Amino acid sequence: CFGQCQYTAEEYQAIQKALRQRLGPEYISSRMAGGGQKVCYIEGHRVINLANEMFGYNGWAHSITQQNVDFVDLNNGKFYVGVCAFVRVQLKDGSYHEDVGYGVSEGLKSKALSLEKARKEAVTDGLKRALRSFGNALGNCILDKDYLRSLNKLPRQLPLEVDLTKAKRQDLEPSVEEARYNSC
Amino acid sequence: CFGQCQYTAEEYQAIQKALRQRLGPEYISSRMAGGGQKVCYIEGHRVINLANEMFGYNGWAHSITQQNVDFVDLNNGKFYVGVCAFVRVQLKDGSYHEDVGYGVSEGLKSKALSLEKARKEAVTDGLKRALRSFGNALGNCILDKDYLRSLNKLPRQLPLEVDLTKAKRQDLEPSVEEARYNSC
Amino acid sequence: CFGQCQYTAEEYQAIQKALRQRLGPEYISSRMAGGGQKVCYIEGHRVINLANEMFGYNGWAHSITQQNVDFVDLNNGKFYVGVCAFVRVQLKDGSYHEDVGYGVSEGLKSKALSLEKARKEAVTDGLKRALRSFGNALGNCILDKDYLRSLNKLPRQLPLEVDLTKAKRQDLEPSVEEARYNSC
Amino acid sequence: CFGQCQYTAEEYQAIQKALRQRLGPEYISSRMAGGGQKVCYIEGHRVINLANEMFGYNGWAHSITQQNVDFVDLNNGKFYVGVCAFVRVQLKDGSYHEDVGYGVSEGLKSKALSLEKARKEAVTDGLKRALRSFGNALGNCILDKDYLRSLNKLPRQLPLEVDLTKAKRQDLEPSVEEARYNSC
Amino acid sequence: CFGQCQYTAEEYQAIQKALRQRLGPEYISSRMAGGGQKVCYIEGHRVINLANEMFGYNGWAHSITQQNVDFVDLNNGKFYVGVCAFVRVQLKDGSYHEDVGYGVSEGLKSKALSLEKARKEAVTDGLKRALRSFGNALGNCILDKDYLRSLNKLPRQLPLEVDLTKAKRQDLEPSVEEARYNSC
Amino acid sequence: CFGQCQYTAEEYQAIQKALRQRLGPEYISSRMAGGGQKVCYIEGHRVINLANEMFGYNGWAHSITQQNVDFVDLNNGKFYVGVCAFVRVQLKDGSYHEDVGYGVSEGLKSKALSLEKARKEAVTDGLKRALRSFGNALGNCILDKDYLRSLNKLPRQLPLEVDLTKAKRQDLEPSVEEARYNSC
Amino acid sequence: CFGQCQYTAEEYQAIQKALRQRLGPEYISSRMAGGGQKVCYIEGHRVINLANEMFGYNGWAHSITQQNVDFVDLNNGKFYVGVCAFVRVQLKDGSYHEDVGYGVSEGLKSKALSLEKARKEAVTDGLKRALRSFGNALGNCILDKDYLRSLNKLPRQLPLEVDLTKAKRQDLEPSVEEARYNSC
Amino acid sequence: CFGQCQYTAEEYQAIQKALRQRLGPEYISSRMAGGGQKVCYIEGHRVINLANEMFGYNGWAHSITQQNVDFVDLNNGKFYVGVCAFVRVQLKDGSYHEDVGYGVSEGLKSKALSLEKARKEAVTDGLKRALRSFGNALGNCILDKDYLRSLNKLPRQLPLEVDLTKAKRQDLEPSVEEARYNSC
Amino acid sequence: CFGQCQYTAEEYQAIQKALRQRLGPEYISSRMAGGGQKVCYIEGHRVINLANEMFGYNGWAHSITQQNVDFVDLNNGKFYVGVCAFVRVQLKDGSYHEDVGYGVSEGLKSKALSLEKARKEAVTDGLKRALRSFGNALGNCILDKDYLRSLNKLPRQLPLEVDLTKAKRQDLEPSVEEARYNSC
Amino acid sequence: CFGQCQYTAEEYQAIQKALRQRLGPEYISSRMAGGGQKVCYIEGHRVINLANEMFGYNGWAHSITQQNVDFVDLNNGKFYVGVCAFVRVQLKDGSYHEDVGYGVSEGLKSKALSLEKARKEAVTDGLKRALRSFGNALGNCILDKDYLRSLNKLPRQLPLEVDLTKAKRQDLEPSVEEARYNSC
Amino acid sequence: CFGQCQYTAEEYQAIQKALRQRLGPEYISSRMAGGGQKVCYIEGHRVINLANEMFGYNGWAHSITQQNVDFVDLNNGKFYVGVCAFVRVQLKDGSYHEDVGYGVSEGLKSKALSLEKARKEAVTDGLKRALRSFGNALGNCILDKDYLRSLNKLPRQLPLEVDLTKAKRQDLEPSVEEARYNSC
Structure with a gap:
């Protein structure tokens, strides 16, 4: 089951080589930090899709080991809330990485x-x-200063328009149900 | 049993490809946020049916790991209640995803x-x-800004009328009972 | 035993197809909400029988994971009691769904x-x-707005009179005891 | 042992079909609710015998998972006592149902x-x-409104006189002891 | 060991049939309830012997899961003590029944x-x-109203004099020790 | 080991038949209850020897599951002490009985x-x-009223003088040591 | 290992027969109880040697399950200390006996x-x-009243002088070391 | 799975020899310590990539065993926060190293x-x-004084410009998906 | 490993016979009890060596199950400290003995x-x-009164001078290392 | 995995002989103790490299079993902080050593x-x-007084200049990746 | 692994005979006790090396089961600190000894x-x-009074000068690495 299967050599090299490179200009977005310069980051769904595409949708998992509210303060009618969360990401081979957000x-x-x-x-x-700890492709490169400097010297690409003519409009999935039937 | 069966290659590719695409205009509904623009979301039963149709009705499970009332305040006779819940969704292969609502x-x-x-x-x-963490088809695309912008440029489709002439009107299920008999 | 048996392909397809459709006008009843319109719901025993008929009487189980009294207030001699309960429903294959009532x-x-x-x-x-999480047949369709609108456009059927001429009037069960003897 | 044996197909169908039907007029008794109409119920020993006859005396078990006194109040010399109990019923196959009384x-x-x-x-x-959750034969039908209406239209049968000429008057059980000897 | 052995078919039918019938007039005794009519009950040792004779002396066990003193009150020099006890009875097959006294x-x-x-x-x-939950023979019939009414219409039998000429007067048990020797 | 060995048929019948009968006049002693009649009981060592002789010295065990001092009161210089103890007796087959003293x-x-x-x-x-719960021979008959009435109609036997000419006067046990040597 | 080995038939009968008899006049000593008659008891080392000789030095074990100081009182400069101890004695077959001192x-x-x-x-x-619970030979007979009365009618034997010419004067144990060498 | 696989001899020597050497001038960066000289350190992502490249991306894991806030002080409107964290790094062979940050x-x-x-x-x-504890290549050499002195005598290399023409611009990974298909 | 090996018959008899006898005059030392006569005891290292020589250095173990300071009192500048310790000694066969010091x-x-x-x-x-509980040779005889009386009638032997010409003066153990090499 | 592999004879002798000798003058450094003489010690990274070179980088592990702040005192604006830590070092054979720093x-x-x-x-x-407990080579000799005296009589060697021409300047490890490929 | 391997006969006799003798004059050092005579003891590293040489460096382990500060007192500006520690030493066969320092x-x-x-x-x-509990060679003889008296009658040997010409001056261990390669 999960956390027991052994990665094959071909799959290992594929995922390692894919994780070796860095991200392209489409993934990184920017925010205006309070009293600071432009802070570059990556959207959550981008990294999520990167995970399901690199390790497979059934190849990686994440759990919230522990979350506790650090503080809830009431100042002149405004609420200052600070919360910490411990998140553990595990692959299907048993490897894992735990970090705080x-x-x-x-x-x-x-x-x-x-x-x-x-x-x-x-x-x-x-x-x-x-997820940053697994390699450069999953978002490590955002912390590299030279990578960000090179990114600043790139043309600002316009956001891509999504072609949704082949979106999901009917519930019944003949292909998925047929494959599951053949698997049962 | 649950969390032990291994996904087959054909089933894996079927579910991965099906999860790769995005949702159609029927799934996303809208709400009028307080002091804000139109906020797009997905109905709960839509996502539930998507889960039972993508992974199978017996292929996915969800549990409430921990729920605690954050606060119950009485202001001038009104009750302000805020509650947090930790929900863990697990597939039949052992993969899982835990998130807070x-x-x-x-x-x-x-x-x-x-x-x-x-x-x-x-x-x-x-x-x-x-469930959002498993791919775009289960509701990830709601967070994509370009996807929402493309959705705004679509015609407003009228809600579909349900044809219920073949609804469930008798309790006895000859097909299900016969299949279970053949399975016993 | 329970939570270990694997569903067969024929049984899987039977239960999936049966769960795919919606309920008929007999199941849904109505209540007059306080300061609101007519609220449609399903009786408990209807859903119970639906469960024992869809998954088998020995195919599904439910347990109360945790129940705690939220509040008991005494206002001018009346008792306002609010209670929450966590209920987990598990199939014989190991799948489960947990929800709060x-x-x-x-x-x-x-x-x-x-x-x-x-x-x-x-x-x-x-x-x-x-039980709502397992499909449309077990009560999911009550939350669909278009389904309710279609239901409102249906004739109001009179309640069915139960024909009890073949009810249980003697304790001894020759068929059940004979089958258990053959099983022992 | 208990909770491990698998039900056979013939036994499964026997118990399912027997649980499908409803109860006869002898089982349901009535009480005069305080400030209400006649409330129909089933005696405890009736349901107990129904359990030992449907699943076997060694086929079902029940345990008290948790019981706590909700309140003991002393009002003008009278004692108002309210108690809750969690009861779990388990079959020999592992299925179970837990409910509050x-x-x-x-x-x-x-x-x-x-x-x-x-x-x-x-x-x-x-x-x-x-026990109500296992089917209509064990007491589910008491909650059906149409079933109760049909019951009201039935003649009021006189209570049956028990013929006890073959009651238990001697302790020694030659048949049971002989069978146990043959089993040892 | 205990709770693991499987009942044989002949033994199962013997014990089931023996448990099906009711008790004879010798077992039920009476008490004068405070401000009430005659309350019928069964002596403890009678039920104990019934248990060791029906399931075997090594076939049934009972344990006190939890006992706590509900209250000890001192009123004008008298002690009002109320105690609750949870008792679990288990057979050699694994079945069990738990109840409060x-x-x-x-x-x-x-x-x-x-x-x-x-x-x-x-x-x-x-x-x-x-023990009442295992069938009518172990004491269930005491709660049946028609059974009690039939009992009231029976002649009052005189208590039986015990013939103790073959009582236990010597410690050494040649038969038991010889059988254990043959078993070792 | 203990609690795992299965009783043989011959041993089972021997112990059951031996436990079926009642005790003789030598075992029961009497006490003068405070403000009451003569209360009949059995000495502890008598029951202990009965246990080691019926089930074997290595066939039965007893443990103190829980003991707590109920109360220690100091009244005018005297100490009123009340203590409860939970004792569990287990046979070598796994059967057990737990009771309070x-x-x-x-x-x-x-x-x-x-x-x-x-x-x-x-x-x-x-x-x-x-130990009373295992049968009449181990002390159940003390609670039977007719048995006590029959006992009252018996001649008062003089206490037996112990013939100790073959008592234990030397430590070395040639027979036991030789048997253990043959067993090693 | 300990608590797993099964007693052989010859060893079982040897130990049972040896435990059946009573102790000789050498073992029982006397004390002058405060405001009472002569109280007969057995020395600790006598019972210890009896245990190592009856069950073997490696055949029995004892552990202190729980010990707590009941009270330490300071009265006019003197210390009144009362302590309770729970001691569990276990044989190599798994049998055990727990008691309070x-x-x-x-x-x-x-x-x-x-x-x-x-x-x-x-x-x-x-x-x-x-250890008293294992039979008469290990000290049960001290509680028998007729046994004590018979003991009172015995001549007062003078204490035996220990012949220690073959005591342990050198550390090295050639026999034990040679046997262990042959066992290794 | 993780923590169970045994390192091969060739892999062992490769990783050992690679860990034996020290780091080059590109890895070490500098900070201006408060009231101190230049403090040399290594960036987090550099060490992360070193880990995934030395042990493999699936060869090492890290978890936060325990983290607690040491102190949060409010001084004249500024917040002084000190936090400690216990981090455990484990290889796929089972070896581990735990340290505090x-x-x-x-x-x-x-x-x-x-x-x-x-x-x-x-x-x-x-x-x-x-990670410092695993060898010189993962960052141990930063603590060596002679190594730092030799580093100070090196030319200050300009930061490298990242050539990102082959960055990740499309989500679909044909190579990774094909390899996983061949592995399934 | 420890607590699992079974003693052989020859080793069992060797250790039993060796434990049967008593100690010689060299082992027992004396102390002057406060306000009492001469109190005889045994030195700790003597008993330790007796243990390693009787059961082997690897044949017996001892652990401190629980130790707690009973009291530390400060009286006029002096410290009265009383401490209790629970010590459990276990042999390689699994037998054990626990006692308080x-x-x-x-x-x-x-x-x-x-x-x-x-x-x-x-x-x-x-x-x-x-260790006293294992037999007379390990120190039980110190409690025997007749043994002490016989000891008092013995000549007072002068302490033995230790001949240390063959003491341990070099670290390297060629014999032990060679034997371990042959064992590896 | 870790803590399970058995050391071979050749490896055992190699590591034992290597651990037997003492350290050379390069490892020991000196500090000026407050109000004391020169205190000799060993740098942390030296001992770390000694560990990875003696037992292998994957042969030894260390964990922090428990760490607690002993005291944090504020004296006239200075902070006196004292902390204790329990560190356990374990080899791949299962041996371990725990000590406090x-x-x-x-x-x-x-x-x-x-x-x-x-x-x-x-x-x-x-x-x-x-790590000091494993032998003289890992740092035990620092505590030997004669060893320190001999060290004081040695010439003061100049620190060695590190030749880093073969340092790590590129991330990709062809040898390590190739070996891991051959191992997969 | 550790605590599971069985000692061989030759190794057992080697270690037993080596542990039988006493220590030489080089090991014991002296201290001047406060208000007392010369107190003889053994240095820690001496006993450590004795352990690694007698049982092997991988043959013995020690752990700190529990350590707690007994008291920290501040008297007129001086700190009186008393601490207790429980240390458990275990061999590779499973034997152990626990003591307090x-x-x-x-x-x-x-x-x-x-x-x-x-x-x-x-x-x-x-x-x-x-470690003292394992025999005389590991430090038991320090407590023997006659041994100390014999030691006092020995010439005072000058401390040995350590010949360190063959100390550890290079990190790389060709012999150890080669042996580990042959073991892998």
């Missing part, structure tokens, strides 16, 4: 929305930081 | 109804966010 | 009756919401 | 008798509600 | 004697109520 | 002696009550 | 010596009372 | 950002210090 | 030295009392 | 830096003291 | 240094006292 809320008035934002963000950057 | 209640007067809404919603978006 | 009591004067109602209702809607 | 005492003066009544009744309706 | 003391002056009576009685009716 | 001290001045008496007596009647 | 100190001035005496005595009579 | 924040005003920095840095230097 | 300090001024003495002595007499 | 900080003003220094130093000398 | 500090001013000394010394004499 932080969720921060400072502007919202409603306490419930503040905790919602804080906990969801804590989990999402926990996942990001835990 | 939040339930919020702010308008209801009765405390019992407020907690009912908060806990049920916390579990439902916990399930949604935990 | 709420029990509410607001009118009864006696505390004991209020807790009785609250806990029993909490468990019953916990079972309902946990 | 409530015991209520409001008239008795002595505290000890009040707790005796409350706890015993809590366990007995816990057993009833946990 | 209550011990009550209200007249004794000495606290130690009151607790002695309360705890011993709690355990004894715990055993009685736990 | 009480130790009482009310006259002694020294606290240490009072607790000594209370705890030792609690354990000894715990053992007695736990 | 009490240690008492009332005259000593130093607290440390009082606890030393109390705990050591508690353990020693715990061992005595736990 | 510290995260420090002293300048930031917002508490949430201070804890974010402190915890993330604590984990990152925990990983660094835990 | 006490450490006492009353004269020392420094607290640290007092606890040092108390704990070390508690452990040493715990070991002595736990 | 202490971290001390007394001069630093910032609390965070003080704890950083204290905990890191505590772990590093815990590792040193735990 | 004490660390004392009374002169140092700094608290951190006092705890450092106390804990390190506690562990070191815990190791010494735990």
